[PDB]
Amino acid sequence: ENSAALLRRLNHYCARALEGAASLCQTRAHAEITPEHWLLKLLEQGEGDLTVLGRRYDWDMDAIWQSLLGWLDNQPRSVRSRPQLAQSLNALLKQAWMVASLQGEEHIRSVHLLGALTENPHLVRCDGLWPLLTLSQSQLQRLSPLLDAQSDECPET
Amino acid sequence: WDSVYASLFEKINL
After folding, report:
1. CATH number of the structural domain spanning residue A151
2. Where is the signal peptide (chain A) (predicted)?
């Protein structure tokens, strides 16, 4: 794969969202970090690629956000320790890296996770994520100039 | 070698 090597390939935005997802799992306890735990924090955070795509395609960001929170509520609780990465998140991490690397990128942004999730809609279980799965990666590839113009996932200068 | 990648790593690889 491998798990630790994939994480260092994440950009600042996605890494912060996963850290915040890990913090939440630790408090909710919450055995593993699922893509939904991460997607929740990605939306929660900013005007990231998902927020920009959400706007230009008009997604009920409230419903998605609400749907995610409701799913995370039906997540088995055990002991408030420190969490593992779910098989679904581990697989998403590998597919998103495959999407990012092929595009000549150095880091994985939320649109690469969306590109991975688009050809792998089974990695997510939460029903309210269907607007995220309406896009194709040929489409998301074309939308790159728009994403650099409005998203916090912005490289520098 | 980010100050922030380490903070993420703090959490459970197994």
Report:
1. 1.10.1780.10
2. none
